[PDB]
Amino acid sequence: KVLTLEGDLVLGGLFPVHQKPAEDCGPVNEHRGIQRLEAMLFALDRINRDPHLLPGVRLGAHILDSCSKDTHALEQALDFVRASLPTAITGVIGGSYSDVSIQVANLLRLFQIPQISYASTSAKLSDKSRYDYFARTVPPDFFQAKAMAEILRFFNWTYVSTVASEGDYGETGIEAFELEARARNICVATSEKVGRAMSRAAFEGVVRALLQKPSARVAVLFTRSEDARELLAASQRLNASFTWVASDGWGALESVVAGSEGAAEGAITIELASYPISDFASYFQSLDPWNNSRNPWFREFWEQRFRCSFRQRDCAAHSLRAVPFEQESKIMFVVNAVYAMAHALHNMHRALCPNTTRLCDAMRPVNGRRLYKDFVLNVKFDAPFRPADTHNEVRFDRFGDGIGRYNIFTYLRAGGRYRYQKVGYWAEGLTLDTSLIPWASPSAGPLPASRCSEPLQNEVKSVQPEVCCWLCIPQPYERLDEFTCADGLGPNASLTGCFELPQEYIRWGDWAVGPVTIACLGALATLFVLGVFVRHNTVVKASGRELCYILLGGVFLCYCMTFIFIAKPSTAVCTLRRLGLGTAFSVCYSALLTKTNRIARIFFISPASQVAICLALISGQLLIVVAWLVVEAPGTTAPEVVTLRCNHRDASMLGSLAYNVLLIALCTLYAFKTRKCPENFNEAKFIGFTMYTTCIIWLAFLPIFYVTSSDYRVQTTTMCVSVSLSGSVVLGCLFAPKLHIILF
Amino acid sequence: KVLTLEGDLVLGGLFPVHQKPAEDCGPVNEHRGIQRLEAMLFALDRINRDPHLLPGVRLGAHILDSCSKDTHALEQALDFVRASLPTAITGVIGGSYSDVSIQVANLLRLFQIPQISYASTSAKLSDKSRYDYFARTVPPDFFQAKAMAEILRFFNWTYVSTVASEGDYGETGIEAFELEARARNICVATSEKVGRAMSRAAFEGVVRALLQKPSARVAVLFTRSEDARELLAASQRLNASFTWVASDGWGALESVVAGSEGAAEGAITIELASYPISDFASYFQSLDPWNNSRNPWFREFWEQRFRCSFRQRDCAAHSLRAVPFEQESKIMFVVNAVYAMAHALHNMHRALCPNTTRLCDAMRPVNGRRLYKDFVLNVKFDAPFRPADTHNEVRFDRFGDGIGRYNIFTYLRAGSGRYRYQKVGYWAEGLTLDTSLIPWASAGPLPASRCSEPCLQNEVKSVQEVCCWLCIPCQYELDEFTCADCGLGWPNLTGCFELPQEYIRWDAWAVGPVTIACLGALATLFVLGVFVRHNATPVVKASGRELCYILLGGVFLCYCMTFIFIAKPSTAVCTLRRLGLGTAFSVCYSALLTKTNRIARSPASQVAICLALISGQLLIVVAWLVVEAPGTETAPERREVVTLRCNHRDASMLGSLAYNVLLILCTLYAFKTRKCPENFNEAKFIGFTMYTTCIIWLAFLPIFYVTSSDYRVQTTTMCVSVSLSGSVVLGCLFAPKLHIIL
Ligand SMILES: N[C@](CC1c2ccccc2Oc2ccccc21)(C(=O)O)[C@H]1C[C@@H]1C(=O)O
Ligand SMILES: N[C@](CC1c2ccccc2Oc2ccccc21)(C(=O)O)[C@H]1C[C@@H]1C(=O)O
Ligand SMILES: *[C@@H]1O[C@H](CO)[C@@H](O)[C@H](O)[C@H]1NC(C)=O
Ligand SMILES: *[C@@H]1O[C@H](CO)[C@@H](O)[C@H](O)[C@H]1NC(C)=O
Predict the structure, then answer these.
(1) What does the entry list as the binding residues for L-glutamate (chain A)?
(2) How close is the Cα of A219 to the center of ligand 3, in Å?
(3) B376 and B396 Cβ atoms separated by less than 8 Å
(4) Are A437 and A410 in contact (CB under 8 A)?
(5) Ligand nearest, relative to CA of residue B435
(6) Number of neighbours of residue A38 by Cβ within 10 angstroms
(7) Cβ–Cβ of B74/A572 closer than 8 Å?
């Protein structure tokens, strides 16, 4: 059957009056069908009574039934399309389920008929390429993903788990939430799926999968009513508690929390926002079958509601005023849709018809394209029958979807008698009032946290073996990158680079003061001795007289080594020191060897031969020294400062000292031959004393050298003062008696 | 009006009988509507009389008129859907224009009715989400773009320009062609578009814009016939020459080319392939209005065709057999579509109801989904009424688009007054043609349009369109963009080459310095010997000649610098060269200075005074040496870089030699004593020697500045000056002794 009301313009409608075997239509749906249909009739009466909207033209209706099946609705829409070619349908206000809306839109876009849908929220319907002529007064479903992502973010939760149901509702929402969470820098731990028919142990499987990765105590649900009920029951069985964030499927229903109330504490849920229409209740309460003849489906609804038959005349007793009335959620959207179409036609009248209250001949056919593209999509008005305080308004976004307002709820521990409570809303951004949720005002510890890793540069932010998680791992000694550590001989404050440590060295400003002073004193004394020696080259000529000058020269050479020693270490400096000690020591002892050899030589011997022998020994020691260092080419860090040192070892220096010791031993034996032989003021005793003194000095120095080689700050000083003391000892033991005798 | 034929199963059809104001559709379209309608009726009769194809089920028809409008098409197509929800239409074969097919497909997908189209070629219909119940026996258009890309790739033409036309055909084809060309590394030169209602001036402007860049001489057209005629013929009004590649818009039509045969010579065009059906000729010519009473629209067609009327009763005179007959191109596709539908239903009957030849109960509501999903798309058979030699087949791919076979044509004028079309190949799945017949493939080179020639390997392929870049090569500096300097110092471009260092030969120019050095050494030895022999004589024994021995040694050393300087560079060599340089002058100057000073006032103490100065010189040189590692030169022309020098700074050498310059003191100490009348005028000799040394030193100065660039000249001048000073000083000092002795 059809419902018809004559008028100048007729608005079609499509409602799910009967539910879904051989038959195509079953029992009557009370809440969704009859209440919404009567709401549409209420709106049409109120608009025709209003003297500002459509003063002249009267609106009619042509309402059909959908029977909750796409095939039946598509079959019935042929009536509208055929009438488009007795009464011409201006528009269609219908579509309760997503699929019926899809089919009717695909059929009607060809013949250019507008459509406004009051309760279709599928996300596939915003693609205006396929559905050119669609409008709706309810927001699309994917806004809930944005709202839930914002709610999660504002509480600082990063590690989350998601559960979705099979079908379009759970799926499309789940990819929407994933896309938004990726943008908001939120990482999803695991993603599950719940089927239509699933056993209790199979639900234990899902909750066990959720418990597989602990430390995630926030579970996002995008589920229908029955699936959520089973999931909460399964959570009750296994004594597992989380903090749940849900879509409008959970909503504020009481059935989903029934017999498993213990787990449902602290859930945050989102629901569509609505207010009661005061006059609709009064209008609906007074319906009776005898007075209401417009509605063809009122008799069957009354028979089903009051379980009575009309043939026996036993139905007159019952009345709707006795039973309680709970107004359905989406009546507001039906009234808003009808009013929006009315306002669009009113603007079209004010524009096209210049000065006639009645229907002008310019609109006898009505152009769908211009109406939809210009006037329908540009409607702004205060919502009819709005609450007195509120300021709700109706407006369509460019894509055709309506504006969105949501309510946010939590589950409250009232005394006991637990109940839902309101905590905020979502118009354009989250506007939570935190004082009214029992888990945040008392501040009992930190807010229930779902995060994997906490965020300085001191410890490297190593890549965790989950990609989202970043484990913090501290080189103390040696990092080029944030997660990588770099390395060398000789770390910066910024800790991303390296700063070169100073290269330690013995400086002249330091320990070195005394050696320098004694070196200058000895050098000056040696110069004066050389001068007084050359001055009277006379008592001088008796004892060789040439060994004396080289005797002074060796002492002078020794002094040169003292400055050589304490200097900046380089390859040149290392070569110079590795050579000079051998030359100095060798010459100094060689002179004495030759002198002692000549003493008592008769009991060959000539001025020319002695210098040849001395030069031969000096050259032998020098050649040994050259090979060592020539083999040991020179070059200048600890596992615990960047000291500079020559890599060459000291064993060769020990060998040079050993050759020197052999020389001194030969001197000792020769002086033992003739301890004090008087030839020229009896020098031989002085020679012997010098030999003993050199023996003692070397015996003190070389073992001390080996002992103190460990520490650098002492070793070089000990070496230099030791050698200088040896040289001054040689001077005092050899020259000094001759100095006193010839001086006076 | 509607044509209906009674039968067990009924097939619907759409045909544009009338063309496209108050009136809905006007004059009757003969070639496009009537011929194809008679084709469908012919196929249905033939199939109904066939022995082994649907033997017991008789097919019927329900044909409608589209009037070439989408809205009218939808209004008439409502009948098919209202039948199901009353002859129970099974499938619809129709849709000539693209828009009608799109609209009817959108309407019919809802109620699940299959559709086969004979002449809809738009690329939008390949999408399966929007239209999932569409199959066509004619290939889509972008196959033409693929074929064009292949044709251009075969002849190696890489710089081409594209001209398109407004309307889905043009932009869709051009987009497909650019995609396929970029797939095959073909770069576009210029793009242009032709409007709906441009004038002759605009066409001339388009031709001028095409001629703006002459690097391309091959033009790709995706245009309709009217635009093609105006563009081509307007290539004589302004003289121009190009090679044309065109879509089916040009084809083999004789109307598009008229009076502009010059500009159109050498063209290449692509056209769909079809073959005549001989039986249709007899069937169509045999038709008469009284005999063929079932067709509703034949009377109007005769009235329009022969210009007669029923009221005057003059129409009986005319007959169809008199006038010549020409076949429409897509009649093959019409018959193929009907036969494909029949074969699909036959497979349904064979598989689903294998027990009875007649119609079965299970089939009475025919399920569209099963038909389309399983039996329509997998049908393959021999084409009906095919030519005897050829082997064609009817099949559909996954998307419902049919196979594609094209023909390739080229213009040709041979005997005088014989301009005409000829075939040069085909395109079934890969391009195939022979150049044997083509006129221009060895009367000159192959006509080419390539922006740049291939770049040389050795020459640098400068990276400046993709093919636009020309070749720019370069000096001393492997790949296209890898131009790198071969280090400090020689390409092969295998790698950098390091030439051996320039070492002066141990050399003809160097011979002379050795000769003068040997002369100096021999003379100094002779002087030393004649001094040794003459020791007893008073002339030499008066001073004692101790300074004479050291002067001879200094002379020997300064001669020895001649050999020392000319040697292969080495760290030790450079160090010794630096060291001895000051040493020679210091020894000589100290010797002369001591010879003056000892009598300017212990003879052996004079040796000590000499020793102090020489030791100081030694100390300063060794300190300046040791300080900087002495060690062992980049230059242009890639031939002077072989030269190398010791790393020690040459200026530091001058700073060191400043001490010896201070010594060059000797003249100061000589000047005051010049008044004293020394025996044999020794002081005068010393002063003359100091002046001579100063003169030689002054002459030394310009040479260094002049030829610091050339190592050879500087070295030769330096050694020459040193030896000259040494020889002059020795001669001056020992002239009295030599004169007295010999
Ligand atoms: N608008 C709804 C939304 C619907 C839905 C609603 C709640 C839970 C699950 C669920 O599943 C899907 C899946 C895809 C698209 C839409 C939905 C419709 O049926 O289209 C429905 C509120 C309307 C009404 O019941 O009156
Ligand atoms: N198959 C065509 C292709 C058609 C077309 C054909 C040739 C030149 C231009 C041209 O313009 C467009 C533009 C967009 C889509 C289709 C076309 C159709 O109308 O769909 C047409 C051959 C069919 C017939 O006219 O019988
Ligand atoms: C969330 O973290 C931000 C960043 O430190 C902080 O400013 C804010 O106070 C935190 N809010 C809550 C509720 O923890
Ligand atoms: C086309 O180019 C290829 C690649 O160099 C070459 O092998 C072929 O011979 C060319 N053909 C013609 C006709 O130029």
Answers:
(1) 32, 36, 98, 119, 121, 248, 330
(2) 20
(3) yes
(4) yes
(5) 4
(6) 20
(7) no
DSSP B501: P
Evaluate the CA torsion angle A683, A684, A688, A694 in order and state its sign: positive
Tokens of B690: 């100091």
Show the ligand 2 pocket: residues with CB < 6 angstroms. B 96-98, 119-122, 167-169, 224, 249
Using alpha carbons, list the distances in angstroms from residue B268 to A440, B18, B223, B272, B502. 80, 34, 14, 14, 68
Chain A partners of B605 at a C-beta cutoff of 8 Å? 534-535
| Residue B601 CA: distances (Å) to CA of A178, B514, B594, B670 | 109, 41, 11, 13
CA of B432 to the centre of ligand 4 (A): 15
Write the secondary structure of B413-446 as one string of H (helix), E (strand) and C (coil).
Answer: ECCCCCEEEEEEEEECCCEEECCCCCCCCCCCCC
Residue B597 contacts residue B548 (beta carbons within 8 Å): no
Non-local (6+) Cβ contacts of B154 within 8 A are: B431, B433
Q: Which amino acid is located at B57 in the chain?
A: V
Spatial contact of B558 and B516, defined as CB atoms under 8 Å apart: no
* Measured torsion, CA atoms of residues B485, B487, B488, B491, in degrees rounded to the nearest 10: -70
Closest CA to B133 of B79, B95, B172, B176: B95
Rounded to the nearest angstrom, the minimum Cα separation between B9 and chain A is 23
Output the residue whose Cα is nearest ligand 3's atom 1. A156
Length of chain A in residues, anyone? Answer: 744
Q: Cα(B98) to centroid of ligand 2, in Å?
A: 7
Query: What is the Cα–Cα distance from B236 to B257, expressed in whole angstroms?
Result: 13
If DSSP states are collapsed to H, E and C, what string results for B338-406? HHHHHHHHHHHHHHHCCCCCCCCCCCCCCCHHHHHHHHHCCCCEECCCCCCCCCCEECECCCCEECCCE
In whole angstroms, what separates CA B407 from the centre of its chain? Answer: 32
- Ligand 3: residues with CB < 6 A are A 155-156, 447
- Which distant-in-sequence residues (6+ apart) come within 8 Å of B371 by Cβ? B91, B114, B344, B345, B348
For residue A709, which amino acid is it? S
Closest CA to A120 of A383, A268, A374, A103: A103
Rounded-to-integer distance, Cα A235 and Cα A267, Å: 14
Return the bridge partners of A244, or none.
A219
Q: Which of B78, B110, B604 sits opposite A537 (nearest CB)?
A: B604
Strand partners, B135: B116
Q: Ligand 4: distance of its center to the CA of B155 in Å?
A: 7
Judged by CB atoms closer than 8 Å, whether chains meet at A110 and B110 is answered as no
Of A103, A535, A576, the CB nearest to B626: A576
User: Taking CB atoms and an 8 Å cut-off, how many pairs form between chains A and B?
Assistant: 31
Contact B29, B67 (CB under 8 A): no
Count of alpha carbons within 13 angstroms of residue B581, beta-carbon side: 26
User: Could you tell me the two tokens for A453?
Assistant: 């890793």
Q: Which of B317, B373, B311 is nearest to B347 (CA)?
A: B373
Tokens of A378: 């540009």
CA distances from A742 to A176, A537, A539, A728 (A): 114, 11, 8, 20
Report the distance separating Cα A526 and Cα A532, nearest Å. Answer: 10
Which token pair is B643? 């030269």
The structure was resolved experimentally with: cryo-EM
> Radius of gyration of chain B from Cα atoms?
55
In the structure encoding, which two tokens stand for residue B303, read together?
């009235």
User: Which of A72, A76, A78, A536 should we substitute to test contact with B (largest number of B Cβ atoms within 10 Å)?
Assistant: A78
Does A693 count as an annotated binding residue? no
Pocket probe for ligand 2: among B35, B100, B118, B121, the residue whose CB has the most ligand atoms within 8 Å is B121
- Return the ∠ at Cα B68 (arms to B63 and B71), rounded to 5°: 90
